[PDB]
Design an enzyme around this catalytic site. Structure first.
Site, short mmCIF file in Angstrom:
data_model
loop_
_atom_site.label_atom_id
_atom_site.label_comp_id
_atom_site.label_asym_id
_atom_site.label_seq_id
_atom_site.Cartn_x
_atom_site.Cartn_y
_atom_site.Cartn_z
N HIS A 42 -18.06 -40.39 6.87
CA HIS A 42 -17.80 -41.83 6.83
C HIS A 42 -18.04 -42.51 8.17
O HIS A 42 -18.12 -43.76 8.26
CB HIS A 42 -16.37 -42.14 6.35
CG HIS A 42 -15.34 -42.08 7.44
ND1 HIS A 42 -14.46 -41.03 7.58
CD2 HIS A 42 -15.07 -42.94 8.45
CE1 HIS A 42 -13.69 -41.24 8.63
NE2 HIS A 42 -14.04 -42.39 9.18
N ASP A 87 -15.73 -35.76 2.68
CA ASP A 87 -15.91 -36.53 3.91
C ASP A 87 -16.33 -35.63 5.06
O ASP A 87 -15.54 -35.30 5.98
CB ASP A 87 -14.65 -37.32 4.29
CG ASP A 87 -14.89 -38.30 5.42
OD1 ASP A 87 -16.08 -38.45 5.82
OD2 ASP A 87 -13.92 -38.91 5.96
N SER A 184 -11.45 -40.36 13.91
CA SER A 184 -12.09 -39.88 12.69
C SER A 184 -13.27 -39.02 13.03
O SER A 184 -14.02 -39.34 13.97
CB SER A 184 -12.58 -41.05 11.85
OG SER A 184 -11.55 -41.48 11.02
O1 LIG Z 1 -10.04 -47.63 6.05
C1 LIG Z 1 -9.01 -47.37 6.68
C2 LIG Z 1 -8.81 -47.95 8.04
N1 LIG Z 1 -7.84 -47.25 8.90
C3 LIG Z 1 -8.09 -46.04 9.33
C4 LIG Z 1 -7.35 -45.78 10.62
N2 LIG Z 1 -6.53 -44.58 10.56
C5 LIG Z 1 -7.18 -43.39 10.51
O2 LIG Z 1 -8.42 -43.38 10.51
C6 LIG Z 1 -6.39 -42.20 10.46
C7 LIG Z 1 -5.03 -42.10 10.48
C8 LIG Z 1 -4.62 -40.76 10.42
C9 LIG Z 1 -5.71 -39.94 10.31
CL1 LIG Z 1 -5.74 -38.23 10.08
S1 LIG Z 1 -7.24 -40.71 10.35
C10 LIG Z 1 -6.46 -46.98 10.74
C11 LIG Z 1 -6.97 -48.03 9.81
C12 LIG Z 1 -7.80 -48.95 10.63
O3 LIG Z 1 -8.94 -48.62 11.00
N3 LIG Z 1 -7.27 -50.18 10.94
C13 LIG Z 1 -7.90 -51.17 11.78
C14 LIG Z 1 -7.20 -52.53 11.69
C15 LIG Z 1 -6.90 -53.26 12.97
C16 LIG Z 1 -5.78 -52.64 12.19
N4 LIG Z 1 -8.05 -46.51 6.07
C17 LIG Z 1 -8.39 -45.93 4.80
C18 LIG Z 1 -9.64 -45.34 4.63
C19 LIG Z 1 -9.96 -44.80 3.38
C20 LIG Z 1 -9.02 -44.85 2.35
N5 LIG Z 1 -9.32 -44.31 1.04
C21 LIG Z 1 -8.79 -43.07 0.62
C22 LIG Z 1 -9.07 -42.57 -0.61
C23 LIG Z 1 -9.86 -43.32 -1.53
C24 LIG Z 1 -10.38 -44.53 -1.16
C25 LIG Z 1 -10.12 -45.08 0.14
O4 LIG Z 1 -10.55 -46.19 0.56
C26 LIG Z 1 -7.77 -45.43 2.52
C27 LIG Z 1 -7.48 -45.98 3.74
F1 LIG Z 1 -6.25 -46.54 3.92
#
Ligand SMILES: O=C(CN1C[C@H](NC(=O)c2ccc(Cl)s2)C[C@H]1C(=O)NCC1CC1)Nc1ccc(-n2ccccc2=O)cc1F
Ligand code: NA
Lengths: 232, 52
Positions: A42, A87, A184
């Protein structure tokens, strides 16, 4: 990485960083050998053009830090944003990594032994230069964090999205420790007698360190054969 | 009758049960020791080892 601590010299040598054109890391990776980096499929959709840095621990001081262009990108054909299932991706570098201080590969475990021996440990280790708070900024320093393996049943309940058998959960219910945006694609590794084996790829989370939510990781044991084939 | 479920069959790394006994093995970049338990790195940056 939210919580945890900075990796000390030599402690997180398989950590790689995916850097966009504006030279900012946006995802992590894991060094598997001189030519190959393990990362999350991703991450590929957050940059059309990116490179791989190794040997780094502090993006604010610039020796031993080194950038590598990607020659070939091998995305799992079954990945999709709709599901975040499958992924995973492997990158071939155009020039080989030379192993040295803070730059060394993590081990690929045999699948059944990893399921019965690594995945049954209490904790694994995740690492990254990602945000140090959900809304915070990426860390200039490479950090690491011990994360408990969480029971598949509990994570399903805890989750608003479908957790597949190609995913696992690690982390804490309430404690403010987790991976986050920018981590990620990076390593989840499990130590067994002083040797660290790749067990996961930081994949996704609903926010970062949220109460009642965990970190979701690509389950590497599900793809040990796929990686193998991708590296040949 | 030996098991990987007790001290990992005394293996350093991988353990499998084979014909009522344990057989150890090692990741790439390691050779199994003559004692059949230990994993001996073949270069200075074997996988999974911190560069201490
Ligand atoms: O897309 C995000 C975005 N986020 C991902 C990120 N956290 C992480 O990537 C991780 C946390 C713990 C681990 Cl391990 S990886 C925080 C937050 C962000 O970027 N906020 C940005 C905004 C300014 C606040 N999260 C996400 C991705 C995919 C999915 N998902 C899961 C299964 C199926 C469909 C789907 O969309 C659910 C989610 F909540
Ligand atoms: Na949580």
């Amino acid at each position: 990485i939210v919580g945890g601590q900075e990796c000390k010299d030599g402690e997180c040598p398989w950590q790689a960083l995916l850097i966009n054109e504006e030279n900012e890391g946006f995802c992590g990776g894991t060094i598997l050998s001189e030519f190959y980096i393990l990362t999350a499929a991703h991450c590929l959709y957050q940059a059309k053009r990116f490179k791989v840095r190794v040997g780094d621990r502090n993006t604010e001081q610039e020796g031993g830090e080194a950038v590598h262009e990607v020659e070939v990108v091998i995305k799992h054909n079954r990945f999709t944003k709709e599901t975040y299932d499958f992924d995973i991706a492997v990158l071939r570098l155009k020039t080989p990594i030379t192993f040295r201080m803070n730059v060394a590969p993590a081990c690929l475990p045999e699948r059944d032994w990893a399921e019965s021996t690594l995945m049954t440990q209490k904790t694994g280790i995740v690492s990254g230069f990602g945000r140090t708070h959900e809304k915070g900024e990426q860390s200039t320093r490479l950090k690491m964090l011990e994360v408990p393996y969480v029971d598949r049943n509990s994570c399903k309940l805890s989750s608003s999205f479908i957790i597949t058998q190609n995913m696992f959960c690690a982390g804490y219910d309430t404690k403010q420790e987790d991976a986050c945006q920018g981590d990620s694609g990076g390593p989840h590794v499990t130590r067994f007698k002083d040797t660290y084996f790749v067990t996961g790829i930081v994949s996704w989370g609903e926010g970062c360190a949220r109460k009642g939510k965990y970190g979701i990781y690509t389950k590497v044991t599900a793809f040990l054969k796929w990686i193998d084939r991708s590296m040949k | 009758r030996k098991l990987c479920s007790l001290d990992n069959g005394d293996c350093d790394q991988f353990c499998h049960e084979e014909q009522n006994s344990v057989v150890c093995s090692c990741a790439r970049g390691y050779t199994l020791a003559d004692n059949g338990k230990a994993c001996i790195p073949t270069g200075p940056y074997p996988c999974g080892k911190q560069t201490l």
